Structures are given as C-alpha cells and as structure tokens.
Amino acid sequence: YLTHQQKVLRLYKRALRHLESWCIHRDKYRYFACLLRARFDEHKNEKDMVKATQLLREAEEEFWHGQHPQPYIFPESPGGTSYERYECYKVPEWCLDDWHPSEKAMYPDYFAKREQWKKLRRESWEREVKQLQEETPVGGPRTEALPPARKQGDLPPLWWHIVTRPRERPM
Amino acid sequence: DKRFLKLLRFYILLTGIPVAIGITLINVFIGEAELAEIPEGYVPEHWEYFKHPISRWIARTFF
Amino acid sequence: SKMELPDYKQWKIEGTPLETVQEKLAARGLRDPWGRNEAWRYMGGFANNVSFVGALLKGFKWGFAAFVVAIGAEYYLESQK
Amino acid sequence: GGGAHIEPRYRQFPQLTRSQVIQAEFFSATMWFWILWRFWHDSDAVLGHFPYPDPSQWTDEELGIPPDDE
Amino acid sequence: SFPKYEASRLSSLPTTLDPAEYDISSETRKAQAERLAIRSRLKREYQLQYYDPSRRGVIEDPALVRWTYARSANIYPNFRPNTKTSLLGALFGIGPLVFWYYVFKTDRDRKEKLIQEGKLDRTFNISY
Amino acid sequence: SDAPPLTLEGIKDRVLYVLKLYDKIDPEKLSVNSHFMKDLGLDSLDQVEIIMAMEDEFGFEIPDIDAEKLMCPQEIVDYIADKKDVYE
Amino acid sequence: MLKYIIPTIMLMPLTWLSKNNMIWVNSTAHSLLISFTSLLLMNQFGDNSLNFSLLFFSDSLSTPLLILTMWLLPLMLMASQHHLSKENLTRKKLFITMLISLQLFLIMTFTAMELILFYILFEATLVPTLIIITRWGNQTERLNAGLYFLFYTLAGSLPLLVALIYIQNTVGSLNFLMLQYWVQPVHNSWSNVFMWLACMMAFMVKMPLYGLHLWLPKAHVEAPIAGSMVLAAVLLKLGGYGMLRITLILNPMTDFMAYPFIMLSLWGMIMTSSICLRQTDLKSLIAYSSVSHMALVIVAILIQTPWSYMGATALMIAHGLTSSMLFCLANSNYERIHSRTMILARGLQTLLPLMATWWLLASLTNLALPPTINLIGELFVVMSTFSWSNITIILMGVNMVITALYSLYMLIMTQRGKYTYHINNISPSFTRENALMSLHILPLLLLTLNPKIILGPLY
Amino acid sequence: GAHLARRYLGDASVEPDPLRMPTFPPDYGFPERKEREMVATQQEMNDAQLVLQQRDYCAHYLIRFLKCKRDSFPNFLACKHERHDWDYCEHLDYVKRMKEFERERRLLQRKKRREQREAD
Amino acid sequence: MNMFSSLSLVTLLLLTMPIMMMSFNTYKPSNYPLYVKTAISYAFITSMIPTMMFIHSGQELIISNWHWLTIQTLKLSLSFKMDYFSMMFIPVALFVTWSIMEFSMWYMYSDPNINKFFKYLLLFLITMLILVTANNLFQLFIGWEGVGIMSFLLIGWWYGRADANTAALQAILYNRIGDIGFILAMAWFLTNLNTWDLQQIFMLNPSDSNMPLIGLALAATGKSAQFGLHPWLPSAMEGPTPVSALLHSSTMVVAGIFLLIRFYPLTENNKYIQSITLCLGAITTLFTAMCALTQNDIKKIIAFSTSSQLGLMMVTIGINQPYLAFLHICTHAFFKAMLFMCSGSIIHSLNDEQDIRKMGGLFKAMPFTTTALIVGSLALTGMPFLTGFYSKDLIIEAANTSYTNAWALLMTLIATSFTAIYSTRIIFFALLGQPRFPTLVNINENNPLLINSIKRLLIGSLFAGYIISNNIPPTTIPQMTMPYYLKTTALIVTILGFILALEISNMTKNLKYHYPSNAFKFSTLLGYFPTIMHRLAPYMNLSMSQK
Ligand SMILES: C[C@H](CCC(=O)O)[C@H]1CC[C@H]2[C@@H]3[C@H](O)C[C@@H]4C[C@H](O)CC[C@]4(C)[C@H]3C[C@H](O)[C@]12C
Ligand SMILES: *C(=O)CCCCCCCCCCCCC
C-alpha cells in the first residue's frame, strides 16, 4: 500500500543521501543537489497518473547502479555508530518493585510520587477498557491508532510503559 | 547480589585465614625434616618416610 | 546556557563559491533554495586553511630556523676541538 | 568541568585557548627537527651507505679470466 | 545496462523494483487491510496484558509454543517406505561414515607394515 | 564527552532559526505555531527540504511516516524534545 | 568402604525421624559432612590399588568418580527444595530417600571388587532414576519411549548377563584382581565376536553413543533438575568405568571391533555440535552437548593408550561438573519464567548481574578454556589420536570449533541481548541460586591447581 | 632484474645457475690462488656466541664491534667507528660475492664461442 | 643474575596484584581506575631495569619456577622465558599500554562499568605478557586463548549492539580456527618429538618439520588476521576505540607472527613454509591496501591501514629475517595506536561521528589533534629516520636483494605506495578542507589528562624507535650493499604514493558528476570476501545442521 504518490518521496530524500556522500564537498553538494532537484522539476508538473506511475520504474531501475559503495548512515539511527550502543545500560522501570528496602531508603521522595503514578495506572484502568469499546469496530479494530481521554483527570489508554520508558542516556 | 559476596568472602575466610597461619606457624618453628640415612636395625613407621609435617601427620592419623 | 545566537543574515553567498552555483544556475534557470544555509562552512573563521603542502610544513618555519643554528653549532663546538 | 571553561558555538570557529595551540607547534616544528638534524650527519642513510659498483666496469684480468683463446 | 539483480535465496530483491507493489488494487488493498486489522486485534489483545498492572508473569505466547512444538517432530508424520527421502535421506547420516572407515583404516594398515619394516620414523616417539 | 546538554528554550531557535535562512519564506510572517501549508503557503515537497535540514542541524535521522505530519514548528520541537526526552 | 556406606544409610532415619522444618537442613549438613570423609579415599599407592575386602575396593581411577558422587548429593538437594516447597511433607521424604539410595548404589558400584556385583548394582542404579524422572517429571506428553529402555535390556543388559556368567565358568572367577592375572588372549572367532558385543553394547547406550542417544534428549526434557544432575554427572559415567575395567580381557579382539564404534563418535561429535546451534531449548541444547563430550571418551577408551585413559578420567569429571552446573544455571531461569525455551527470555545480564557471571564463567570452561581440566583431558586425548591416526585432528578441530561456537551462542542469546519487555518477574538472584553455582565452578578450577588427583591410574 | 632478464630471456646456458653456483673447477686456468685466512679460530667463534650466519671470514672484524659495546654501557654512541671496520670489511665481501660470480659467468659465455666453432 | 631474574618476574605478578584487589575487599572505591595505571607506570620502571641488564649482558634466562605436572616422560611448569623478545617487546607494550591507560581513563567516563572496564583491560595485558614469556607450547597455548577470550568481552563491551555480538563471535570463530594448527603442532612435537619445551624442540633440529610448521602457518592466518581468515580484524571497530587501540592494533594482532619468530631455528631450513607465508602476506598485504584504497570508515580504515602493515610482516618473516621483522612489531604499534587515540580525539569533538566524509577543517580547530596525526602517517608511510621507516627501508632490503618469488616482489611495492595513499585521503578529510561536521560545534580538547596520554605516545614514535635501534646487539649480517635504486626504491616509490593519491584527491574537488566503477566497489566492498563468506558459510553450517 502507501500509494505511489508518497513512494515518490521515499526516493527523493534517500537518493540525495547517496548523492550527498558522493558530493562530499559543500559547494558540490548544493550544486549537484540543484541538478537532482532540477531533474525532479522536469516531471514534477507531470500530472499523468499512467505516466507518473510509469515515471517511477526507471528511477528505481536507475538508482541501483548509482547507489553508494559505502553509503553514509546517521549515528543513532539503525546501522549507525551509536546504534543501540547504550541499550545495554538502559534499565526497565517495572523492576523498581524488587528494590531492597535499604536501597529504597536512599530515595524516599521519588518513590512517594510513583505510588500516585501507579495509582492512576490502576484506578483509570477500568474505564480505559470501556473507553475503547465505543471506538471498537466489529471484526477486530481496523487500525492500531488510539484516542485521547475525552474527560479530565484520566489518560489515553495503553500509555504506561511509553510514558515511563527509560531515558536516552542512562549514564 | 552484593550481599552474596559478603557470605562467600567471609565464610572462606572464616577458617581460610587460620589455614595459612597454622601452616606458616609450623613452618617457621617446626619447618621440614631433612633426609637421613638408615641406621641398621631401625625400621621406621609408615608415616616416617615423609618430609612435610602436615604430610607426615596426615599419614599417621588417617592413611 | 543562554547561547546568544547571532544574526541570521550573517550567512551569505557573496564572495564565496556558494553563489558560483547561483551564477551557473542562471544557465540552469533555477536557484538554490538554501543559499544562506551552508555559508558557515566557508564563514565564521574558516576562510583560510593550509592545504596538503602546508599540513606537512606545519610549524617547520621555527624548526627550519633553529635547524640551521643546530647544525652550525657542531662546527662551533667542533672547530675549537 | 571547571564551570564550562569552553562555551560551544553554533556554526563557528571553536572557542579554543592559546595554551593548547602552543605545544602543537613545538613537536610539529620539532617533527622535522630530528629528520634534518640527523640528515646532516646520517646523510648516507637517505642517500646510500656506500656506492654500488656497476658490474659492466670490470675486467677479465681483475677476475683472472682466460680469454677465449686462453 | 543495469542488469537486474538475479533474485537468490541469500539476496532478497529491493523493495522498489518488484512489479507487484507498484499497482495497489483491491486485489492488494483487500489483503493489506485484513492483515493490519488482524495484526491490530493481536496488538489489542496483547495490549491489555502488557499494560495491565495485575499480571505478574510471562505471557504464554501461542505462536511460540507451536513453533517449539513443531520442532520436536518424532514419529507423527512421515512413512517408513517413502523412497523419495528415506533412502537418500538415510545416506546423509550413514554415507560419510563408511568413507571414514577406509580413510583411517588404510593408514593404520599402511602404518603397521612400515613399523613391521621400519619404514616410518618413531625414534623419538614415546607418547602413544 | 563532558556534557552535551539540551534545553527546550535553547532548542527553540534551533528549529526556528533553520527556517530563518529559508529563501521561500518571509521571516516576520512566520510564527511558532504557524502551519506551513496554509499560514506559510508552502507544500509537502517544500516541507521535505525543511525536515532534511533538521537532520544536518541536529544529527539524527527522521522516519518517513512521522516527517510529514510535522507541519507546525511546535510539533517539530515536540519531535526533537520528545525523541531525546528533553523537557526543560 | 563401609565407613561411607552406613552413614549414607543413616541419612534415611535422619530424612524421616527429623522434625518437620529441619528435613532439608539435617541431610544437607551431614551429606556435606560425609563428603569430607570421602576425601580420605585419595590414599592411593604407586604400584597397587586399595583392596579393603572381597566386597569393595577403590583404585586411583575409582576415587575421583566417588568424590564427585558424594560431593554431588548435597548440591542436588539445594536446587530441589525450591520446587518441592509446595509438595506435602511425606513425599519430600520419599524423593529424598531415593537420592540417598541412589548415592548408596553408586558409591558401592564404583567400589565393587566383583564384576557381577557391579552388574547387579548397575541395574539397581537405574531404578531410583526412573522413579525420580517419572514420578516428578516435568511433562505429561506420554512420549512412549519405553522401547528404548526395552532396547537397552535387549541389546544391553541381558546379553551382558550371559557373557559375565560365561567368563566365570571359563576363566573361573570375575574378581577384577583375579582377572589381572588370569586374563587370557581372546583369539578371533564368531563366538568371541558375539561375546565382545555382550561386554560393550551394554555400556555404549548409557554413555550414550551416537545413534543410540535418542533417550537422552527426551530424558532431560522431562527429568526434574534433581534427576537431571545425577544422570549427566554420574549415570553417564557408569559405562566408561566398566568399559575401562572390562576391556582388560577383550584384547586383541578390540583391535578391529572398535572401528564402527570409533567412527560413530569421530563423526558423531560434529553432528551433535551442529544441531545444538539449531536447538530451541536450554536443556535440550545441553543434552546433545552432553553427547558431544561423551563421544570423545568412547574413542579414548577403545584405543586404550596410556594418555587416552588419563584424559578420559578428567573429561568425565569436568563434563560432570560442567553439565551439572549448566543444568542448575539453566534451571535458574526456569525458577522465574517456567520454560525451557531459549528465546522466550533474553538480555538477562540487564537484570541478573551475578547470574551472568556464572554463565560466562561456566561457558568459558565448557569450551575447554586453558588450563582448566576441561581442556587438560580434552587436550590430552587429542594428542593420543595422532599416534593412532594423524587424520583425526580434522574432526577434533572441527568439533572444538563448533563446540566453541554454540557454547558462546547460548550465552550470547540469553545474557548478551535486550530484555524481554513483557516479562515482569525477574527477581534478584537468591542466595541459594548463586551458592549452588559457586560450589560447582570453584572446585572445577581448583583441581586445575593440582592435576595429580584426576589423572587416572596410569599416572 | 637485468641478470634475471638476460639469463632466461637471453640464452639460459651462459648464466651460471645461482643455486648450483659455483659449478666449474676452481683451477679452470686460475693459478696460484692465495688462501683466505681466519683470524679468529674455532675457539674464538665458539666463545663469541654468534649466529653461524653471523660467522664468516669478515666476522673476525665483527668481534671488535661489541667488545667496546659491552663496556660502552649505558651510552651507545661510543663504538660507532669500529662498526665500519667490520661493515666495510663486509662491504668488500659483497663485491667479492659479485666478483666470485663473474668468473663462473665468464667461463660459460667464453666456452660458448669455443664450442660454436668446434662444430660450425 | 639474581637481581636480574628476580626483578624481572615482578612485572607479571605485580600487574596481577590490582586484579587480586577486585575480587576481594571493598576498602577504597572510586580510585581503582588510577590504581591500575600507576601499576603499569610502576611496572614500566620494573620493565626497564631488565632492559639495562639485558642489553649489557644479553642474559637470556629460562626460569622454571614450578613442577606442575608429570606424565610418564613429560613435565609441565609455570615457567617463563626471559630472553631478547620479552625484554624488548614488554617495554613497548607497557609504553603503549601506559599511553592507552590514561587515554581510557577519560574517554570511558560515560560508562558506569568503567571499573569493570579496567577489570579486563589489565587481564588481557597479563595474558599477552605470559604468552611472549612462555617457554612451552602449553603455557604458550594458554596465552593464545587468553587473548582470544579477553578480546571476546572487550570486543563486545556494549553487549546490546548486534554488531558487537556478531563481530565478537566472528573473530572468536576465526580465532578458534587458528588454534587448530596450534593443537596440531603440539601433537606432532609430542608424537615425533616428545616434549613441549623449546629447549628440546630446537636442539633436536627436526629434519622433516613441514607438518608442525604448517600448523604454525595456520595459527597466524586467523589470529593475526592474514588473508583467508582476515575479515574479523576490521570487525573489531564496532566497539570502544580504546579497546581497539591496544588489543587489535598493538598487542593481540602481533600473536600470529610472533610464533614463527619464536621458532626461528626450525623455520629457516623448510622453504615450503616460507613461500606460502611469503605469498600469504603478499596476497594479504595488498588485499588489505587494495581494499583500503576506497574504504570510508575512520575506524575500519585504520583497521585496514593496520591490516596491510600486519600483512607485510609475514613477508618479512617469509624472507627469513628473524630479528628484523621483530622491529616492525614495536615500530608500527606506537603511532597506529596513537592514531586510534587520535581518531578518538576526532570522534570526541565530533560527538559520535565517524564517517571520513563528515570531517574537515581541523588544522586549527583541532590544533593538538592535527599535531600528532602527520607524524604517525609520515612514520607509517616511511619518513626517513622515523619509527616506521627503519623497518620499511631495512625490510625491503633482503626481499628485493635476496632469493624471492617473482610475483612476491610484485605486490610488495604496489601496495607499499598504497600505504601512503589512504593516509593522504585521511589527512585530507581529517585535516584539509573547511569543516564539514554538523552545525553545532562540540569541539573541545583542552583536557590535560588526554594531553598526557597524547604526550607520552607522541614522543615514542619520533624518538623511541630511533633509540631502540642503537642498544640492540648484532644478530645478523646486514645487507648494506645493494644497487642504489633497490636501496632507494622505497626512497623512490615513497613519494609517489603521496603524489599519486594527491593526484587522485584534488581532482575530485571539481564540480563534475561521478561515475560508478566495478573496481571502485570491489575494493570498497572488501573484495566481497566478507560480504559473501559471512553469509553462505553460516548458512551452510546452520541451514544444513537440522538434516
Ligand atoms: C593499606 C591501604 C589502606 C590505607 C587507608 O587506610 O585508606 C590500602 C587500602 C587502599 C589502597 C590504595 C588505593 O587502592 C589507591 C591508592 C592511590 C593510587 O591508586 C595508588 C595506589 C594506592 C596508594 C593504594 C595503595 C594501598 O593498596 C592502599 C592504600
Ligand atoms: C629487475 O629486478 C630490475 C629491473 C631493471 C633492470 C636494469 C636494466 C637496465 C640496467 C642494466 C645495466 C645496469 C645494471 C643495473
């Protein structure tokens, strides 16, 4: 799915990066980038769906033998230098329970508020069940999108871990 | 996880420490025998063919 | 902390090759939409940079000046025995 | 961490200090110091230890080689 | 020019060259939507347990069990006199064994006679 | 690496200052919450270029799906603030 | 040898007469205590073994296996009590009693001076195991694997009974000491070829042998942790004991009958190692891994070289310590996720720091890291094959590689990874769990300090 | 390799085979060859603790190099001159090695002309 | 004597005392990271006292300080071989380690397990030193595995990163394969010979030692990352830079060649080993550079840049140069490890950026970093009188002036110029050109600790390599006589690499579109050896396992 219209973009941005690494130099990059965008603007006004459908086959058949021998990839993104390098240090939140008493005695204040954080993780849970049963089509929910809370004091269902998910840098 | 090493550390040392001390104390004052020839008519014990005291003693008591 | 951000018209293409793309773009009948975006890669204190020849010859002026003195000192320290 | 003794900039030359720049030239200048300060007295190393004779400049007599008739 | 890559077991095709996905008709729209809703329902069904404070344990995945269950295939399938795989499959497990039978045996038979005639070196050999 | 801190107030202009060098926008008309398509009279293809600049500006890739919807500077700030978990 | 038999028996009243809540402690305290006296059995002599009476005796080879068995009973109890806490009082005494008897048969087995008596105890040793595996099994899938144990009796025990009897009538006695002096040259005949199969096929299945191993992977998949430990730590080692002793009288016939056995292992080692990389279970992966190491021993015994026997002794020891620890280590996770699947839980180093230290520790010596005894024996045997045949190094090299490949994989798959998000009962390591592993790893290294105690009798 | 090139690309026989070299009689018209002495006898080489490859005719100079070196400790720039005595003496041997070859090279080349006319 | 031997053994035991303080006690936390470094600092001094005595006396001492085991007619001990290599290779390793020691005390400030980090850094050092000092194959084998295992954890420090898990096992897979020859060698010396003590092995002077040496050839194939078992060495650059600096640049990678040198008396007569080893380096020494001409990863490029140096070392042994090759070990380690640390400086100021194309404008924005980058490169490229040139000019002597294969000398110089080629491609992006890093500037290296680390490791290459030459006593007949071009062919082709790459580098400035080329990808994609042999071979072993 996703339509070919959006499929145009998926080569617009990606093709630049391989071109970007090829360009290397800054003045080259912008100039060559203008060369590529100029080619896009050759057919950007083309509104023929058959041709626009047919004006994408060669582009993908054209880019394959132009793809970078060692394409650049951003650090934090998949395959990058910092690709999950710190996942070994990130710690689950739910393990807070098994903390030894004496250990917990160091942070009396922080744990006090958590009990309220979990409090609305429990009391709000029940109505959160019904909160989806009016936006619940028969035959299984059509999509995985979720609604907000249509009242005050509650929160959108299915939220606990993401809100409590650890931070980017444990240390 | 830290506590476990408390027991492992101490318990081995509970009698581990005297073990070296007991050996060292004997070595300094009792030390080790020296090989001697067999005067005719002297047949030793079974445990009188060893040098180290603990090795010597272990023979007589147990083996 | 406060990180005073300077003026946004400082970045410009005048006198730098960024506009040379613009000059050649007239024959191409377009313009770079981000002309002022990457002016820093040649502005802000990066105008002059020693090339490959200069890199190897980094600081050799002082060593070169001191090198002649050192070699001569051998004659100074050897002529008198 | 002495209170952010370096204040980072945005699209700018680094906020460096002279002290770091000082010692850079010493060794960088001294880099060629040893290269040439020994080239003068180690001149052979970069320009051969001893000349290599060209073989064609030899003779039968020096090699004691009887000529064809001999 | 740009000779299209030969699809291989160890090289999946690029996503933007398969002719199937360029056109997305009902024959593809119908299938795509059904999987998402089916996948969504699983997420919804799993979403309750994941975000329910009550649970203290490990979800008993039904997919995992079957995957593990199918691995331990012992006698239930397969037929004894199925010539397609029994004869050839049995070879992969009894074929190479005999090959080693002669490999080592030949050397030892070869080796023994040399010792009986001294045609092999052992002068400084003890560990045996 | 000592400390590369991040602050929402400091980041505020980092997203907006990216727009301050655009050649298709009047800087003064632009606002913190201005929708790009309507308030700024821009297009998705034009919007693509702005999203890219953030990756060179800050150094972290952006998913194709979520890049599109970031039509508001606050949302772009939210994406940067929320992804790195910056709250102050 | 009575000084260890009766006190072993005395645990039975202690297991029974004791109070309600001191059932575990009392046996644990003395069981550990008895092993201390077990160390006395290391009074070997250079030329002669130790002959107490006509009913028991322990040579240099026997003792190290004896120490492991006695040393292993208390460790089996430690792991047991967690899963048995829910069981009613009477049954726990029942289960505990079987172990005491199981140790009793074992200690008497390896020390037996008369082969038939060894044969008798050999059969007895199985009975406690079957109850433990069956009565407190971990599954209810009714595999109907009886044919394998029926096959064992048909192709194993029962033939052995006749051959043992035949030898006594012909030679005139089955006392191993007598056999040392009345052993006769077994010339070549079809009858002897049949006699030879009677003396060895019985022990081959228990090792086990490649092809005949189908029971072991399914035996551990169901046996509880208490049952599993003795099986791989002791029961597998019974065959080598008898095979080493019994082979005293099969020469020269063994000079050619060994080849089909040797080829089964030489190639069997690689096959098992590869499949482990495909296995989908922590215990089953260990199962075939167990077959791997045991395959090396079979080759050592058959060739009967002075180095083979030395290396074989440690391989049984190190493997017994190794696998036993691995089961306990693997069964540590079972105490949380109640599963054998290896991929259900991952990245446990994020939540069980000291647990991973054992995992890395145990895995290191599993692949025969130097200078540990895991490698002293395994490396001892590899050299011996060279004199028997130079080509063998190819398979040993491949086996060590793959054995090094999967051993680290299991560690990699579980500890070195990302935590399972949904799992929410990864409690901190308990004192009992960590203590159990420590008792395993530590002595395993210590013996590396002094190798002269598990070098076998040839040393 | 001019010598490598000329041998095979040229006639192979003329050039003596480097491995079998020398291959012709020592007295092939070469009279009254003075012997090559050895200053350091078997005893001195043995006590010198030198690699056999490090031992040769010129090695009798090589002994002088280290003798100063051992006493030179801790400094190292005290025995420089003595080294050239052995190295230059080594330098002469390399030329000799080159000169030794030619007497084998000349005979093969000269002998070709003699045999060419013996059957032309 | 007594003083010489006694003070020598302190280093191995002294280095281990901090380790014994990690498993016991809790007296002083937060100070161990400095504790270890000072021990090496102290250890270096005790590693220099043997240096003085050894040079003056040349006292190669084999000390058997235990009776561990005894089989029939065998005996194993925890002995050490105090000889030339240990006395001369230990000081360098500590010197490099001492530099790296303080380098890591700063870079890894982001790791709560920094104390664990040092719990293993000191472990590897111990094993490596025991390896070189080992008098017997077994004890030598132990170190052969300790480096193998200590690498496993250090390679995979961040166990989360799939690259670490895959790469760490990739190397372990290869590292184990090399041991097959090692275990084979012990068997042969146990069957044909009867012991694993080098005293008996050399004295008996085996007459047919093809098989034992063949195992040695394999040993270095994977452990030192020679071609055929090379790919893992670059794979180590998926983890910490300091970890790569010592293990895979100066200490572990030297294992493969070391064994051949340690068996010099046997290796001489059999030329069958020499040819394949000579050819093995030949294929590798260029295959590394040939691949490295267009690679685009700062850390991996350095790995390849290191690979070629290692690949050539085999050729140096392949030409029967026992003690001359040894020098290349120490000489290369200094700067290359410094380059790792220098690459650390780049990555530091870059805030986790490593693409070579995302670097530039660092001549004055990174003054100190720029300072030592050229020396290592120039020393690496063979600048006269520098640490790397001595071996480069000396080593090429015999190979080009002694019996050698025709094709062996072919790739010998083709890649030699390539050695400098990537250096210019590196210093160009690294230092030449205006900055190309992301918009925000995180550049700051006013860190005194690192300057101490750079200071210590900047000096050695400039001067220490020069100093090391003087003291070492004669052991060979140097080939001081040779044709001038052969003596200067390195002095001729050396400048070509800089210029030829400079010819390649500068023409790419022009605003002209690019064109794909197969060879541009064959070398860039690592010759397809990893891209292929690390898919099917795992598939063969695993996909076929179930049947
Ligand atoms: C005996 C002494 C305890 C002194 C005390 O009461 O703190 C022990 C405990 C802590 C140890 C010290 C700490 O480990 C670190 C100290 C500072 C440097 O790291 C060098 C070693 C150093 C000097 C150590 C020397 C010695 O081992 C110490 C000093
Ligand atoms: C081969 O290894 C070197 C190639 C050059 C051969 C030299 C040919 C021209 C000069 C020959 C006469 C002078 C002697 C060097």
Structural commentary:
The structure is cut from a larger assembly and holds 9 protein chains of 9 kinds. Chain A has 171 residues and is mainly alpha-helical. Helix content of chain A is 50%, strand content 0%. Chain A has helices at residues 3-23, 26-43, 49-54, 57-63, 101-104, 108-131, 160-164. In chain A, helix 1 packs antiparallel against helix 2. Chain D is mostly helical. Chain D is built from 3 helices and no strands. The longest helix of chain F has 15 residues, at 44-58. The relative contact order of chain F is 0.19. By secondary structure, chain G is mostly helical. Chain G is globular and about 65 Å long. The longest helix of chain G has 32 residues, at 306-337. Chain G contains 18 helices and 2 strands. Chain G has a two-stranded antiparallel sheet. Helices cover 71% and strands 1% of the residues of chain G. Cholic acid binds next to helix 2 of chain I. Chain A: Pfam families: Complex1_LYR (PF05347). Chain A: It is found in: Mitochondrion inner membrane. Chain A: InterPro entries: Complex1_LYR_dom, Complex1_LYR_NDUFB9_LYRM3, NDUFB9. Chain A: It comes from Bos taurus.
Q: How would you summarize the topology of this molecule?
A:
The structure is cut from a larger assembly and holds 9 protein chains of 9 kinds.
Chain D: H1 18-37, H2 43-46, H3 60-63
Chain H: H1 2-9, H2 42-48, H3 59-71, H4 80-119
Chain I: H1 2-20, H2 32-57, E1 61-63, E2 69-71, E3 74-76, E4 80-82, H3 84-107, H4 114-133, H5 137-155, H6 162-191, H7 198-204, H8 210-223, H9 232-235, H10 241-251, H11 255-262, H12 264-267, H13 271-292, H14 298-318, H15 322-350, H16 367-381, H17 387-401, H18 408-430, H19 448-471, H20 484-507, H21 518-524, H22 529-533, H23 536-543
Antiparallel strand pairs in I: 1-4, 2-3
Helix pairs in contact in I: 1-2, 1-4, 2-3, 3-4, 3-10, 3-15, 3-19, 4-5, 5-6, 6-8, 8-11, 8-13, 10-15, 13-14, 13-18, 14-15, 14-18, 15-16, 15-17, 15-19, 16-18, 16-19, 17-20, 18-20
Bound molecules: cholic acid and myristic acid (MYR).
PDB class: membrane protein
Keywords: Proteoliposomes, Membrane-bound, metabolism
Entry title: Inward-facing, slack proteoliposome complex I at 3.8 A. Initially purified in DDM.
